Amino acid sequence: AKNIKKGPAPFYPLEDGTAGEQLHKAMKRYALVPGTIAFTDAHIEVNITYAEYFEMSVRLAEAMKRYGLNTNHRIVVSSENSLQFFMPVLGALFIGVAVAPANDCYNERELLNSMNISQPTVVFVSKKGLQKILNVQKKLPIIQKIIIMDSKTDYQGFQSMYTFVTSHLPPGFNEYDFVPESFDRDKTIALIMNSSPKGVALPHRALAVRFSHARDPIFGNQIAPDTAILSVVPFHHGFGMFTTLGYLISGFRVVLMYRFEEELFLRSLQDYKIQSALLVPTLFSFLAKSTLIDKYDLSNLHEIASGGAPLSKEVGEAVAKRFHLPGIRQGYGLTETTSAILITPKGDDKPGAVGKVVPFFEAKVVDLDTGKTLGVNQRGELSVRGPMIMSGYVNNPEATNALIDKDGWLHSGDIAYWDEDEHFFIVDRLKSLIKYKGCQVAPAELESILLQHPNIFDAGVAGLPDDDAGELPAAVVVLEHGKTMTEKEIVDYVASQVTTAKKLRGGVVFVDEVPKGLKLDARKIREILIKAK
Numbered sequence: 001a002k003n004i005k006k007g008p009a010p011f012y013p014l015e016d017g018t019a020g021e022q023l024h025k026a027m028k029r030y031a032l033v034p035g036t037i038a039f040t041d042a043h044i045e046v047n048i049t050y051a052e053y054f055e056m057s058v059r060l061a062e063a064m065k066r067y068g069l070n071t072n073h074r075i076v077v078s079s080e081n082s083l084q085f086f087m088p089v090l091g092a093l094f095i096g097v098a099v100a101p102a103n104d105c106y107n108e109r110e111l112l113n114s115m116n117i118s119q120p121t122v123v124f125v126s127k128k129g130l131q132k133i134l135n136v137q138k139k140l141p142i143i144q145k146i147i148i149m150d151s152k153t154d155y156q157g158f159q160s161m162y163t164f165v166t167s168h169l170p171p172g173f174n175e176y177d178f179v180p181e182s183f184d185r186d187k188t189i190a191l192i193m194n195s196s197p198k199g200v201a202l203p204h205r206a207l208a209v210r211f212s213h214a215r216d217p218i219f220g221n222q223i224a225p226d227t228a229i230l231s232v233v234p235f236h237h238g239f240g241m242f243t244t245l246g247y248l249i250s251g252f253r254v255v256l257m258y259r260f261e262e263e264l265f266l267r268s269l270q271d272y273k274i275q276s277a278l279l280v281p282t283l284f285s286f287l288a289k290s291t292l293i294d295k296y297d298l299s300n301l302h303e304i305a306s307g308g309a310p311l312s313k314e315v316g317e318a319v320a321k322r323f324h325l326p327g328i329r330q331g332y333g334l335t336e337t338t339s340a341i342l343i344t345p346k347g348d349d350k351p352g353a354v355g356k357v358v359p360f361f362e363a364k365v366v367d368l369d370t371g372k373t374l375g376v377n378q379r380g381e382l383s384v385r386g387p388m389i390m391s392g393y394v395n396n397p398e399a400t401n402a403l404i405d406k407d408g409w410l411h412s413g414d415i416a417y418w419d420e421d422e423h424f425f426i427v428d429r430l431k432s433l434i435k436y437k438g439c440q441v442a443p444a445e446l447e448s449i450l451l452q453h454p455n456i457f458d459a460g461v462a463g464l465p466d467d468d469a470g471e472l473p474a475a476v477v478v479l480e481h482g483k484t485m486t487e488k489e490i491v492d493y494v495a496s497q498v499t500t501a502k503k504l505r506g507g508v509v510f511v512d513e514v515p516k517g518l519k520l521d522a523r524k525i526r527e528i529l530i531k532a533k
């Protein structure tokens with residue numbers, strides 16, 4: 001058992017009851033403390049108090065409960081990051097209705113298939129996303145109601161969140177006497193997240209564990225709710241969803257930035273007195289280089305975190321020195337593990353490490369071809385188990401069991417080693433998966449589009465390392481015998497077929513063979529790609 005790394009016992013205890021109960025219990029409290037702000041849009045200088053947030057989420061839960069929704073139902077929240085985003089999430093959580101967040105970047109096909117899985121009864125959506133929701137509802141009969149999020153009044157004949165609640169609540173309804181539902185938090189699903197595409201069922205139990213990590217003085221943030229954090233992370237993904245839920249149960253003021261502005265990301269830090277910034281590894285070179293950074297009162301900024309993708313050790317400690325931080329704080333996780341399950345422990349900074357095993361979890365490194373558990377400083381595939389690991393892929397047990405073994409070990413597709421202090425380091429990726437500016441890009445979609453081309457015999461798609469995007473989608477192309485085609489042509493061809501995140505920005509390299517085994521070798525493909533550039 002010396003080769004199994006285990007989290008310590010939690011520094012903030014696990015709390016009783018559903019995640020809805022825990023959220024409600026905590027926000028009801030913040031809601032009684034005058035002037036406590038829950039969310040701030042940094043762009044337009046608009047705040048929503050905890051009081052207001054709590055009241056609207058409660059109005060929403062009762063309305064939904066009266067509309068007929070129970071633990072047998074799901075909803076979708078399809079919306080770009082906004083002040084209103086969490087209202088239906090919290091609302092549904094209070095009553096045990098599963099929330100299925102949809103990526104606001106999704107096209108109609110991806111969206112249709114996401115919701116084909118989640119089977120939601122009601123859909124919450126912004127103005128931007130309504131027309132897509134409509135085109136889907138036609139093909140998806142189970143959707144019976146579409147409610148607009150970023151409108152106060154009704155819109156194109158559809159109820160807003162506000163008119164929807166006034167119409168389903170009994171008059172003289174009191175929010176502060178609402179009691180959230182109790183249910184078996186192990187079997188009641190809190191969220192169904194997309195995993196590129198499948199539905200990741202996350203029970204309430206997993207959220208309860210996250211709420212422990214979140215308020216943990218070592219593995220999250222110490223609970224002084226007089227705290228302001230700035231977050232630039234998409235709400236619809238696990239990184240943004242479970243950090244933010246943890247910030248709310250902590251009573252933090254969550255300051256939001258949707259677009260990174262060099263002039264703003266520093267101004268917002270100074271004016272709002274940001275104590276902690278939750279960032280993605282792409283903004284780090286910016287924050288390492290910019291000279292404007294020098295003149296603001298940031299004495300209140302004691303922490304900067306990153307996650308979701310690799311952070312350069314060197315860049316990380318540069319940004320850490322400039323801000324007089326002990327180091328960049330980090331978290332590593334997958335959608336299937338709910339949230340981060342490796343996290344840099346406060347006071348235990350070690351540059352380049354993504355952190356240590358969180359409480360309740362275990363981690364191990366298994367050899368790439370024998371599957372044997374390995375020891376200290378040995379590169380292998382990282383496997384994890386613990387109570388935030390998803391219940392399983394919604395209506396896909398075969399993909400569930402290939403990912404999660406008989407003993408609960410989830411093999412992550414990442415390559416890692418742990419050192420003597422039990423610090424973990426992520427040094428490579430086994431699986432085929434690209435992250436372009438945080439956005440997931442499945443190589444298989446790109447490959448099938450490439451093969452479609454008459455001049456293309458075979459192709460392999462992987463990530464090309466980019467300093468400001470992390471990875472650029474790029475391809476090894478094997479031309480059909482005696483057929484010709486340039487890189488520019490292959491690129492515009494693919495562009496015509498794909499949404500903006502999947503554009504083959506990394507270019508193309510021509511080869512005689514796409515590296516395979518007995519399945520595509522992502523590492524060998526990334527190798528050939530860089531060998532060029």
Ligand SMILES: Nc1ncnc2c1ncn2[C@@H]1O[C@H](COS(=O)(=O)NC(=O)c2csc(-c3nc4ccc(O)cc4s3)n2)[C@@H](O)[C@H]1O
Pocket residue numbers: 238239243305306307308309310311329330331332333334335336338339340354412413414426429440
């Ligand atoms: N820190 C990291 N370093 C290097 N690689 C990282 C990484 N995090 C995710 N990855 C990669 O993303 C993959 C998973 O992709 S994924 O499905 O989209 N899911 C995620 O990326 C994911 C799900 S939850 C989560 C995080 N939560 C946090 C909470 C606090 C904090 O300080 C930092 C973090 S990161 N990230 C991993 O397998 C790995 O390849």
